[PDB]
Amino acid sequence: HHHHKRKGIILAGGSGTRLHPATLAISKQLLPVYDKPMIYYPLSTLMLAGIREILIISTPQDTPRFQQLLGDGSNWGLDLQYAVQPSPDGLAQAFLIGESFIGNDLSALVLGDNLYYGHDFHELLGSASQRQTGASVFAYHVLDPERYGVVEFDQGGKAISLEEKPLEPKSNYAVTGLYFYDQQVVDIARDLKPSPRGELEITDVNRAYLERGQLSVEIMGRGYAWLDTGTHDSLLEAGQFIATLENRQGLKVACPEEIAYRQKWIDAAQLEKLAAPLAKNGYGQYLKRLLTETVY
Amino acid sequence: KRKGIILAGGSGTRLHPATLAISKQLLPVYDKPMIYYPLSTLMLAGIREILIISTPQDTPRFQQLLGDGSNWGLDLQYAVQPSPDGLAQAFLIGESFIGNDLSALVLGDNLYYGHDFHELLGSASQRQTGASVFAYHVLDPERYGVVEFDQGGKAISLEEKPLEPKSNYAVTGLYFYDQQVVDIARDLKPSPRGELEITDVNRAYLERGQLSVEIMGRGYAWLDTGTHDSLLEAGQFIATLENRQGLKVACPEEIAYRQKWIDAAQLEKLAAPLAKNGYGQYLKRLLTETVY
Amino acid sequence: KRKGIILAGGSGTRLHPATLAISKQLLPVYDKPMIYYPLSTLMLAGIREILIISTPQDTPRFQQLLGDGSNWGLDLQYAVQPSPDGLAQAFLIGESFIGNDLSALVLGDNLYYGHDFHELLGSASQRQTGASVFAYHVLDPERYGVVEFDQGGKAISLEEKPLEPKSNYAVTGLYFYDQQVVDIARDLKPSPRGELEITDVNRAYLERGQLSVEIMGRGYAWLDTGTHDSLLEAGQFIATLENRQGLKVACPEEIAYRQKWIDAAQLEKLAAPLAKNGYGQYLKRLLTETVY
Amino acid sequence: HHHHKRKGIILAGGSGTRLHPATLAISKQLLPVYDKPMIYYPLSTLMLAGIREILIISTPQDTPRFQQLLGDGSNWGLDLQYAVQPSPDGLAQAFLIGESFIGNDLSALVLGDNLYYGHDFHELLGSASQRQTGASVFAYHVLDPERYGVVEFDQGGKAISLEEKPLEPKSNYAVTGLYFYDQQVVDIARDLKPSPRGELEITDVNRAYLERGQLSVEIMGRGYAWLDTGTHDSLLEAGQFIATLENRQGLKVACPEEIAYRQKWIDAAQLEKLAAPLAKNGYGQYLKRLLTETVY
Ligand SMILES: Cc1cccc(Cn2c(N)c(N(C)S(=O)(=O)c3ccccc3)c(=O)[nH]c2=O)c1
Ligand SMILES: Cc1cccc(Cn2c(N)c(N(C)S(=O)(=O)c3ccccc3)c(=O)[nH]c2=O)c1
Ligand SMILES: Cc1cccc(Cn2c(N)c(N(C)S(=O)(=O)c3ccccc3)c(=O)[nH]c2=O)c1
Ligand SMILES: Cc1cccc(Cn2c(N)c(N(C)S(=O)(=O)c3ccccc3)c(=O)[nH]c2=O)c1
Ligand SMILES: [Cl-]
Ligand SMILES: [Cl-]
Ligand SMILES: [Cl-]
Ligand SMILES: [Cl-]
Incomplete structure (x- = not known):
């Protein structure tokens, strides 16, 4: 195999x-x-x-x-x-x-x-x-961590456990989807x-990465x-x-x-084509506006 | 019927x-x-x-x-x-x-x-006999059929989406x-x-004095x-x-x-496939709860 | 009175x-x-x-x-x-x-x-004579005074915030x-x-048969x-x-x-200091609009 | 004057x-x-x-x-x-x-x-x-720029005009408050x-800074x-x-x-004092939770 996702x-x-x-x-x-x-x-x-x-x-x-x-x-x-x-x-x-x-x-x-x-x-x-290499997930503070995969951190901010929908969550940090x-x-x-x-x-997939030291x-x-x-x-x-x-x-x-x-x-011409059939509603009008408006 | x-x-x-x-x-x-x-x-x-x-x-x-x-x-x-x-x-x-x-x-x-x-x-x-519609006070009567009433409350005109509405009463759907x-x-x-x-259907009844x-x-x-x-x-x-x-x-x-x-046995059949959610649970409660 | x-x-x-x-x-x-x-x-x-x-x-x-x-x-x-x-x-x-x-x-x-x-x-x-209250079906009857009815619709008990509500009918405020x-x-x-x-006031009337x-x-x-x-x-x-x-x-x-x-002249006085917002504009419209 | 806001x-x-x-x-x-x-x-x-x-x-x-x-x-x-x-x-x-x-x-x-x-x-x-030195404001894309101070940018992203509540906005970028x-x-x-x-x-204050080349x-x-x-x-x-x-x-x-x-x-003791009179409602309970929970 040769290299040149x-x-x-x-x-x-x-x-x-x-x-x-x-x-x-x-x-x-x-x-x-x-x-x-x-x-x-x-x-x-x-x-x-x-x-x-x-x-x-x-x-x-x-x-x-x-x-x-x-x-x-x-x-x-x-x-x-x-x-x-x-x-x-x-x-x-x-x-x-x-x-x-x-x-x-x-x-x-x-x-x-x-x-x-x-x-x-x-x-x-x-x-x-x-x-x-490895795997990356995101942790987000929630009111109801019990509904999700929950991540526990040590005092230095390093992840040390993952639990799927724990009845007694170790933290309020849910793993996003x-x-x-x-x-x-x-x-x-x-x-x-x-x-x-x-x-x-x-969560089992994610814990396998964590056990290998390969979970961010x-x-x-x-x-x-x-x-x-x-x-x-x-x-x-x-x-x-x-x-x-x-x-x-x-x-x-x-x-x-x-x-x-x-x-x-896609380019400006292509976006204009997509705007055409949607022209009579706000959505197509929005798409048309993007062809001329600078949005930062 | x-x-x-x-x-x-x-x-x-x-x-x-x-x-x-x-x-x-x-x-x-x-x-x-x-x-x-x-x-x-x-x-x-x-x-x-x-x-x-x-x-x-x-x-x-x-x-x-x-x-x-x-x-x-x-x-x-x-x-x-x-x-x-x-x-x-x-x-x-x-x-x-x-x-x-x-x-x-x-x-x-x-x-x-x-x-x-x-x-x-x-x-x-x-x-x-005749026709019956309902008039409802709205903020934007120009989006609807608008009914105009005289001083005695009698309906005297109907206009579809008028640029100058004669009242705030829209005919509901x-x-x-x-x-x-x-x-x-x-x-x-x-x-x-x-x-x-x-609105044209409704005006035809109004013109014949048969629109309520x-x-x-x-x-x-x-x-x-x-x-x-x-x-x-x-x-x-x-x-x-x-x-x-x-x-x-x-x-x-x-x-x-x-x-x-439908009867209680039929209502109970309908609740069964929805029993895992609140809607079937609601259908099931309807069998045992008196609601006035 | x-x-x-x-x-x-x-x-x-x-x-x-x-x-x-x-x-x-x-x-x-x-x-x-x-x-x-x-x-x-x-x-x-x-x-x-x-x-x-x-x-x-x-x-x-x-x-x-x-x-x-x-x-x-x-x-x-x-x-x-x-x-x-x-x-x-x-x-x-x-x-x-x-x-x-x-x-x-x-x-x-x-x-x-x-x-x-x-x-x-x-x-x-x-x-x-007597007392009159209203019962309303709610999802969380335990937060309120709860009225229990018998099979004929007659009120038979009242409990304030019961841990085991006898119905879903709350007495409104x-x-x-x-x-x-x-x-x-x-x-x-x-x-x-x-x-x-x-609820104790209301039960006292209920016990005398004078709570509606x-x-x-x-x-x-x-x-x-x-x-x-x-x-x-x-x-x-x-x-x-x-x-x-x-x-x-x-x-x-x-x-x-x-x-x-209050009469139209008084309603017009009240509208004046609120005339710059929609509330006075509403009070003013009330003088000229028939609302059924 | 000597130096040591x-x-x-x-x-x-x-x-x-x-x-x-x-x-x-x-x-x-x-x-x-x-x-x-x-x-x-x-x-x-x-x-x-x-x-x-x-x-x-x-x-x-x-x-x-x-x-x-x-x-x-x-x-x-x-x-x-x-x-x-x-x-x-x-x-x-x-x-x-x-x-x-x-x-x-x-x-x-x-x-x-x-x-x-x-x-x-x-x-x-x-x-x-x-x-x-100078002045700093923030520009935010809105639906109704006519209600605000509006900023206009040239093709390189540099601010070139400010208008107070223009009936014909030059852009959709409002100056925040x-x-x-x-x-x-x-x-x-x-x-x-x-x-x-x-x-x-x-807006006149801000335009004075802009005219001096001192508005970010x-x-x-x-x-x-x-x-x-x-x-x-x-x-x-x-x-x-x-x-x-x-x-x-x-x-x-x-x-x-x-x-x-x-x-x-303020320190943890002081936050605890503030939590005391609010203890029976969610707000004081929230403040108490912050004394022990790590929030990133
Ligand atoms: C490709 C691209 C890169 C950086 C910024 C944008 C602009 N953008 C943004 N920021 C957003 N967000 C508001 S977003 O990053 O929070 C976002 C983007 C995709 C799906 C949900 C939220 C958007 O929905 N559409 C956009 O075109 C587009
Ligand atoms: C058949 C029947 C007659 C009289 C009352 C009722 C009870 N009822 C009511 N009142 C309502 N309403 C809250 S309603 O009359 O305003 C209604 C009814 C059908 C569609 C929208 C609202 C309902 O949605 N479902 C009901 O079973 C049912
Ligand atoms: C004095 C009077 C008697 C009958 C009808 C009306 C009209 N009315 C109504 N119906 C209402 N309601 C929408 S209401 O009866 O449900 C109401 C009235 C007072 C407080 C809350 C709701 C209202 O808020 N203001 C009114 O002037 C007023
Ligand atoms: C002092 C400080 C610095 C950096 C982050 C925080 C955490 N924080 C944040 N981010 C927020 N935000 C959600 S915020 O930056 O968008 C914010 C902060 C103040 C007022 C409105 C929103 C907050 O309301 N309270 C906080 O304690 C606090
Ligand atoms: Cl952003
Ligand atoms: Cl009803
Ligand atoms: Cl009514
Ligand atoms: Cl953040």
Whole structure:
């Protein structure tokens, strides 16, 4: 072999019957947060990290619906592929479903219902994606760490334990649903035995890296918003939050067409074509405005 | 008898990209699809036989969701509006469904709430001649059909989206009609904006002295879910009432049960596949709790 | 005649640091001070003679804000509750105000809304014997006085904040009483938590067969503004109704005018100093607009 | 004179009758945003900038009310002074009212109803406060620039004009209500003639610095939230925003006691004393938790 890449995965799985009847009509990650499908937010997040080749994993039934929404990604300078997940057998199954997609490359895994926002988010992601070996996760202070993977730190700020959804959390630092992995993750994932609750657990993957001294735990500061979108109440809260920001600024959070344009993955002519069919609504008008307005 | 029509019309691209993923009237208002609210409204008026009109793309998605409605004691049919060429087109598309019966039409993105709403609908539906609409005081009457009243409270004009509204009373998206409505709709010409106007149907009744315009009081909430902002506001409004009360607004399973269109055993069957979430848990509680 | 009491009790430090700057019941719910809502409620029941009870610190601030109420056709008096030692203490503090008349008590942080609320209050106030309270289905009945009904709908028990509630029906913070209430309150002993309980007053009437418990339907909104979260929710709820309708909820100037306690010239005087904002503009519009 | 400071000003003036009747009961900057008086947010902002000596300017009637809330500041390691503003004669009057307070020192002026939030806000402020000469302002992209002072940039990103509330804005970049000044501002302020609308205008002060080549215009990025709190609707929106963040994180935005503690202006014993009278509510419980929890 001769030399002359980091690939993305969005787990947009079946949310069961938890949000029914809202979700009888459509899968969770197709429901909007304010003005855009939920999946726009994690997609935009991977895009901000510089990732163009992205696998979307969803149920057999939802796959064609995501495909209708997003296509192959080529209109936005992306290469979107799709894989079906028959059964909800944990998040780490992503690496077995996505094995041939990842191949010998670096990877990033993001949850389809996580929403992130803040200043220099691009730089926070960039430094995780820059580490070409080991694994990188983000820790975020929350009120309810028991709902998440929880990280414990020693007095010098070094991570010393990870626990999946502990009933007695060692700290208030939750591991966010955005993970950066090197080439070892698939082989780590293949050795996972399902948990007491019958799932292949992402926390076990992360603990394998930690045990090898190869896990970076970066703090995602309190000046960032990490919002969850998996209850009716939290989905509503997330929409209000985005609406308040966007209406204040006259700028959008997680507009994929914008992010592709600013990454130079598409050019001004291409953005104009995307603006055309959306011209009679605010979204297409927004895209048109980006062709002439300097936004810092 | 009175049959129901839900016009779940196409919103073009106004709600894109949200509506590139899911049909407009399948978008949730808080915890249930938008269409449950007008469905529940017709159900509260005692209407079991309902035509859902939508776009060629969305109509099959409503049908996949709701089926024939037998599970809720309903008789649901479907029809397609090829192009959004006016709300009054509902009566032409719905002509064979309506037949020789009385009808009611509700817009798919209209949400209603308040005390004795059941009685307000009952009074309209019991008039078996003429037409009955509701007037509601709004801040932005220019977005709607506007009804003008004289000093005695009699309705004297109707204007669709007037640049100079004659009052702040908007006609809500809920309309009751006798056997004349199909033939009135057949003899409409399109307006200046290429639409068969529901306001034109309503004016035809007004001109014959057969339009009843009842006030929907300020104690009722009439909300519009046609924009991202209004949809969001409607969600918060419902969430606040539901979380306060531990009761739902516009749960079709509940309304069917209270109308005795379905019995406790059927309500229990419906609760089963939703039993892992709060909605089935709510359906189950309805079997054992007295709610006045 | 029936006189009114607003108990604007001390919330201790529960709302600090917000309540280090301003009295709890002067905090705004959207666009007006909290106290306007219960004031408007009493006013809607036809009650013009109102005692405002509050803390030694807050009472003078209500008095500085509202004066004697003559500008709104009211007769307002003030009294102090030295320590928050139970809601029933209102009747002891208010004994000389009440005199030999009928009374009504409303909690200062309770907000009500809905269709024919005027009629619901009127029916309670017209009973000149016994007591009348309202039961409302809630999600968290353990935070309130809970009324238990038998199979015929008759109220059979009342419990204050039960660990095992017998129903989901909470007694709302609105109470109507005959001439017996002062002497019932005088013969109460403090509860296990050192409070003269309003639920104990209500049980004394229940034991004599003179408590009316009417259902406040699910079509009414009864909201609590006692926490930062509930206050915020109440604000959004009011804002949504007001911005939809272009009408206000619980504007005392409006209710006085509609009750004919003040006339158009007085309403016009009140609008003048607020004419630069939407509230005076609203008061001014009320002079020329028919609102049903 | 022998050698061996930047002072703060909060303009918490009379908001007229615009928010009545809510404000008949209390002045605008005493109204809460979610769980704390509005003034807590600009106060915390100056504190984050490292500023301890702060003048609060308000009406004769409101002065004692702010004084009851805040005292002299010494409980939080601050030196709070108060000056009365009889008449609402524009924002720049602050420098004439505050002349003897500023003396020969550097200054910062902040509006009592501006709310800011985001990652590395401390660093954004630090770099403005570090410039010991000239003036520093922040530009923020908004939907409605016509409500504010607006800054225009040339193609190289250099500020070339400032306009107060233009009916035809040159850009969407509003000047935020947070201003850093050197020793020249009082003398600049004394030469201001009132505007067409009878006010001493902050934009005229800023343009004087710009004309001297001494104005830095830093971009406040879209990852920061700058919210306005001066309508009933926006106050409500601001409260929802703070509530969503705080309830998500179990951390507070603009808790002054926290900021003083983290600045080391008060110590753990002093924070414990402040926690005591607030112990039965969430706020005092929060303060107690900060004595034992490491928050990054
Ligand atoms: C490619 C790129 C790099 C750096 C900045 C931007 C501008 N940007 C930003 N900052 C944001 N954010 C508000 S963000 O970094 O917090 C973000 C980005 C993607 C998804 C969620 C939030 C955005 O949504 N869209 C943008 O075009 C784009
Ligand atoms: C069949 C029936 C008749 C009268 C009352 C009720 C109870 N009810 C009510 N009142 C309501 N409302 C809160 S409602 O009348 O304002 C309503 C009803 C259907 C759709 C939207 C609001 C409801 O949503 N579901 C109910 O089962 C049901
Ligand atoms: C005196 C009067 C009697 C009947 C109706 C009205 C009109 N009205 C109504 N209905 C209301 N409501 C929306 S209400 O009855 O639900 C109400 C009234 C007072 C306090 C809270 C809600 C109102 O706030 N102000 C009014 O002037 C006024
Ligand atoms: C003194 C200090 C320096 C750096 C960070 C902090 C932590 N912090 C932060 N970041 C915040 N923010 C969320 S902030 O920088 O966006 C801020 C700070 C003050 C007022 C508004 C927002 C806060 O409110 N309280 C804090 O104690 C404190
Ligand atoms: Cl941060
Ligand atoms: Cl009404
Ligand atoms: Cl009801
Ligand atoms: Cl930014």
